[PDB]
Write a protein that holds these residues in place. Structure first.
Motif, PDB file in Angstrom:
ATOM      1  N   UNK D   7       0.851  -1.181   0.000  1.00 47.63           N
ATOM      2  CA  UNK D   7       0.000   0.000   0.000  1.00 47.63           C
ATOM      3  C   UNK D   7       0.888   1.233   0.000  1.00 47.63           C
ATOM      4  N   UNK D   8       0.782   2.041  -1.050  1.00 47.29           N
ATOM      5  CA  UNK D   8       1.489   3.313  -1.103  1.00 47.29           C
ATOM      6  C   UNK D   8       0.768   4.308  -0.205  1.00 47.29           C
ATOM      7  N   UNK D   9       1.515   4.947   0.689  1.00 45.58           N
ATOM      8  CA  UNK D   9       0.947   5.877   1.657  1.00 45.58           C
ATOM      9  C   UNK D   9       1.334   7.324   1.409  1.00 45.58           C
ATOM     10  N   UNK D  10       2.559   7.582   0.962  1.00 44.22           N
ATOM     11  CA  UNK D  10       3.031   8.935   0.716  1.00 44.22           C
ATOM     12  C   UNK D  10       3.703   8.998  -0.649  1.00 44.22           C
ATOM     13  N   UNK D  38       6.299   6.234  -0.497  1.00 46.77           N
ATOM     14  CA  UNK D  38       6.085   5.657   0.813  1.00 46.77           C
ATOM     15  C   UNK D  38       5.191   4.437   0.740  1.00 46.77           C
ATOM     16  N   UNK D  39       5.747   3.268   1.040  1.00 49.93           N
ATOM     17  CA  UNK D  39       5.033   2.003   0.949  1.00 49.93           C
ATOM     18  C   UNK D  39       4.648   1.496   2.334  1.00 49.93           C
ATOM     19  N   UNK D  43       2.779  -3.846   7.620  1.00 50.45           N
ATOM     20  CA  UNK D  43       2.923  -2.864   8.678  1.00 50.45           C
ATOM     21  C   UNK D  43       4.333  -2.366   8.921  1.00 50.45           C
ATOM     22  N   UNK D  44       5.180  -2.393   7.894  1.00 44.34           N
ATOM     23  CA  UNK D  44       6.554  -1.917   7.999  1.00 44.34           C
ATOM     24  C   UNK D  44       6.816  -0.833   6.963  1.00 44.34           C
ATOM     25  N   UNK D  45       7.481   0.234   7.399  1.00 43.43           N
ATOM     26  CA  UNK D  45       7.749   1.379   6.540  1.00 43.43           C
ATOM     27  C   UNK D  45       8.806   1.020   5.505  1.00 43.43           C
ATOM     28  N   UNK D  46       8.463   1.179   4.229  1.00 42.48           N
ATOM     29  CA  UNK D  46       9.361   0.875   3.122  1.00 42.48           C
ATOM     30  C   UNK D  46       9.336   2.049   2.152  1.00 42.48           C
ATOM     31  N   UNK D  47      10.471   2.721   2.002  1.00 39.91           N
ATOM     32  CA  UNK D  47      10.622   3.795   1.031  1.00 39.91           C
ATOM     33  C   UNK D  47      11.327   3.251  -0.202  1.00 39.91           C
ATOM     34  N   UNK D  48      10.793   3.561  -1.381  1.00 39.65           N
ATOM     35  CA  UNK D  48      11.373   3.099  -2.634  1.00 39.65           C
ATOM     36  C   UNK D  48      11.467   4.271  -3.603  1.00 39.65           C
ATOM     37  N   UNK D  49      12.616   4.397  -4.260  1.00 36.58           N
ATOM     38  CA  UNK D  49      12.821   5.402  -5.290  1.00 36.58           C
ATOM     39  C   UNK D  49      12.464   4.815  -6.651  1.00 36.58           C
ATOM     40  N   UNK D  50      12.120   5.695  -7.586  1.00 38.57           N
ATOM     41  CA  UNK D  50      11.564   5.248  -8.851  1.00 38.57           C
ATOM     42  C   UNK D  50      11.948   6.228  -9.951  1.00 38.57           C
TER      43      UNK D  50
END
Lengths: 379, 289, 5, 136, 5, 5, 5
Positions: D7-10, D38-39, D43-50
């Motif tokens: 789930x993308x959040x930010x 922001x993924x 329930x764990x914060x995962x940031x990914x660049x694209x």
């Protein structure tokens, strides 16, 4: 040793084309080459009207791109010009006034896009009209096979000379039943030779009203002939008014060739260029009357106001004002004098024109009406 | 082949059972095709009056010699509007002479693929002629390939006769029997090329059933059954269970070794049919009707 | 389209 | 490394309001826009660049490249759903010339399209066969 | 049928 | 298309 | 629905 049309046809068929033209639609018709060098192809107007793309396919298969030259839907004649012509074959035109009911005819065209199709017949009759009481119509009628797509094609005599352009058929079902009509070549000559020289058809009028002559009117008016043109009324300042054609006269002939009907007579001169001098055969009170005539149109007169110069560089004085004209919207009246316009003074019709040649979006005229000095506005 | 646009024609037939009706016309055009783009049609076009029943009637010149067999008309209302079509007498002369000897036609193939030559393609190929047969490719092991025919060449004449169109040329030779020697005029790189030739010989499940398409079959080995080569999804054979690779072994308690032994009981017309094909190692049965 | 002969 | 069920959040630090916002947001960013996401997986914060993506010389549904030393233009392969594959182009062919004009490389292919012919007549080779193919 | 010419 | 007499 | 970002 059998007869055949093949020798005549193999000379003429290179001179007849097929046309492809494209709520978007795709259309097909036919055309006939008028000028070998310039690539002029004559065709029916209801084939290339509202045309975005005009592709012409010769007898050998060679495709060409063509664009519009002239059009006159009142007669259903249109002229196109092949772009970049290479080795084209013009047709030889005959005078359709030599035609006679019973002469053998040959029609060439593209029925249903099949390709060039040759069909034979005779002159069924001549001078036919009435199928569109407001169109210029003087059709040759023929029993030669003609269907959807033959429009704009060639109707030639047995020597191959072009006598007419196939236009429309009388058919309750949309398929030939032995009644095809073709615009005579002489109308095509007068119409196309105008579209080249003027781009459109310079229409002239004589200023006479009239109705057909039936065998019932011949009795009442002590007239001998049973078919012709009955001069109801002549407009003043018209060529016929000037020429002294009076009301109740009957037009029997045109330039020697007798007239078959008013509707034919209307269509003949509808194709003559303005100023075409001619002679008419009248019949008034049992006296044979010949009359010569000159067509007419229906300083710098701008938008319905006649004007010329006043004094020595004193501007341009308006001389007449037709009511209900652009001039009437501007308000200008006869006798009005212009001094300047758009902060520029006007001395003559040349200085006026060089501001009109400058073509501005709005026009502010510094006239003087009576004793007052006012401004007028335009555009 | 001596006909030209302009010659006079006399159409003879029997419209509407009225009786023998003679009508008059001229050759409107030649080499016409497209009514049924698969048919071999090099039709003559004539404005001679032709209606329902003229079919199979003779089209003759002013000397009474047969120049074509009236075949079909174009009529959006079913009544003649001056457009009739006749198969040239030379195609009839070549197809009648084949039915006299063998009862059917030895459909010969030369071995070149192609398509029509329009005015646009001759501008691209910078070829002079604006009509003819354009050789897209030549099939290997074909008599035509044996003769020296390159792809991209344009055909212009056959036996000297000019070619109106590819579909006409295809229809002209679609009638001549296997082995007919003929001459061809070509145009490869603006050069004229002449060559003589000779036909070679040339299968749907509807070429064995009538009505069962989308299953290409043939014999297998030396009398080892009718193998199914390829099957298309949703075709009248795959609706019953014929898959690609099936080896038709037998039917109705008799062995099927080839397309010949198969047709010994097909023509016996049984009510219900039971194939004994095999899907590889498995032995399955198939039913029809 | 294409056709064979 | 974006997996399904995430789930993308930010987006670039600004929280997303909705998917309809996000589809409209990045739908305007130019092709190649490097962004960060922001993924939320398990329930764990995962940031990914694209970096945005599109939607040798391949011309109109057909991929080509050079071949050898002026050996024409070898055909690579074609997706069966392209308008170029619907005209019978198969993998492996080699174009020695087109429209009666000899072709050494691709600079002489697009110099034939620089001339813009109405129909394109190619002299390709499949197997030992010399064949022709047509366009438009 | 009262046209003008 | 066409008709077949 | 089924929209693609």
């Amino acid at each position: 040793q059998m007869p055949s049309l093949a020798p005549m046809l193999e000379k003429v068929m290179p001179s007849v084309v097929s046309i492809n033209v494209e709520q978007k639609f795709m259309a097909l018709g036919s055309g006939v080459i008028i000028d070998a060098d310039k690539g002029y192809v004559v065709t029916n107007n209801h084939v290339v009207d509202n045309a975005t793309v005009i592709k012409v396919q010769l007898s050998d298969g060679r495709k060409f791109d063509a664009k519009m030259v002239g059009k006159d839907p009142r007669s259903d004649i249109a002229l196109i010009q092949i772009q970049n012509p290479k080795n084209l074959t013009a047709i030889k035109m005959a005078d359709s006034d030599a035609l006679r009911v019973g002469d053998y005819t040959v029609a060439i065209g593209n029925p249903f896009g099949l390709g060039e199709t040759v069909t034979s017949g005779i002159v069924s009759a001549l001078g036919r009209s009435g199928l569109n009481a407001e169109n210029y119509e003087n059709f040759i009628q023929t029993d030669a096979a003609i269907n959807r797509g033959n429009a704009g094609g060639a109707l030639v005599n047995l020597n191959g000379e072009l006598i007419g352009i196939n236009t429309a058929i009388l058919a309750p079902d949309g398929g030939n039943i032995g009644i095809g009509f073709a615009i005579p070549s002489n109308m095509v000559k007068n119409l196309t030779s105008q579209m080249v020289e003027y781009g459109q058809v310079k229409r002239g009028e004589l200023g006479i009203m009239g109705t057909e002559l039936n065998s019932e009117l011949a009795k009442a008016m002590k007239v001998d002939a049973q078919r012709g043109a009955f001069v109801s009324q002549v407009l003043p300042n018209s060529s016929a008014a000037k020429a002294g054609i009076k009301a109740g006269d009957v037009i029997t002939s045109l330039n020697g060739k007798p007239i078959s009907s008013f509707a034919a007579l209307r269509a003949q001169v509808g194709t003559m260029p303005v100023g075409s001098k001619l002679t008419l055969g009248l019949l008034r009170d049992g006296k044979q009357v010949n009359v010569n005539l000159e067509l007419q149109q229906s300083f710098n007169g701008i938008e319905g106001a006649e004007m010329s110069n006043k004094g020595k560089d004193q501007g341009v004085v308006v001389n007449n004002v037709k009511t209900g004209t652009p001039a009437a919207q501007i308000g200008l009246k006869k006798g009005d004098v212009i001094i300047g316009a758009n902060q520029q003074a006007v001395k003559n019709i040349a200085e006026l024109r060089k501001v009109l040649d400058s073509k501005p979006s709005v026009l502010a005229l510094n006239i003087q009406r009576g004793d007052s000095t006012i401004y007028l506005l335009m555009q | 082949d001596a006909l030209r646009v302009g010659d006079y024609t006399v159409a003879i037939g029997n419209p509407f059972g009225l009786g023998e009706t003679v009508t008059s016309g001229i050759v409107s055009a030649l080499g016409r095709s497209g009514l049924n783009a698969e048919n071999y049609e090099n039709f003559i076009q004539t404005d001679a009056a032709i209606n329902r029943g003229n079919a199979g009637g003779a089209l003759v010149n002013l000397n009474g010699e047969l120049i074509g067999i009236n075949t079909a008309i174009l009529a959006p209302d079913g009544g003649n509007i001056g457009i009739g079509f006749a198969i040239p007498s030379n195609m009839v002369k070549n197809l009648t002479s084949q039915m006299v000897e063998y009862g059917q036609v030895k459909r010969g193939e030369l071995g070149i693929m192609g398509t029509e030559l329009n005015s646009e393609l001759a501008k691209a190929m910078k070829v002079d002629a604006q009509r003819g047969a354009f050789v897209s490719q030549v099939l290997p092991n074909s008599s035509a390939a044996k003769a020296g025919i390159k792809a991209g060449d344009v055909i212009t004449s056959l036996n000297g006769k000019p070619i109106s169109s590819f579909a006409a040329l295809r229809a002209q030779v679609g009638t001549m029997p296997v082995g007919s020697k003929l001459t061809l005029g070509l145009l490869r790189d603006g050069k004229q090329v002449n060559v003589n030739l000779e036909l070679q010989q040339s299968v749907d499940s509807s070429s064995i059933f009538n009505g069962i398409e989308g299953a290409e079959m043939s014999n297998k080995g030396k009398d080892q059954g009718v193998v199914v080569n390829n099957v298309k999804t949703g075709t009248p054979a795959a609706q019953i269970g014929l898959k690609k690779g099936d080896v038709i072994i037998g039917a109705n308690q008799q062995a099927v070794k080839n397309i010949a032994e198969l047709r010994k009981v097909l023509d016996s017309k049984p009510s219900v049919l039971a194939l004994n094909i095999q899907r590889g190692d498995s032995t399955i049965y198939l039913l029809m009707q | 389209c294409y056709y064979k002969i």
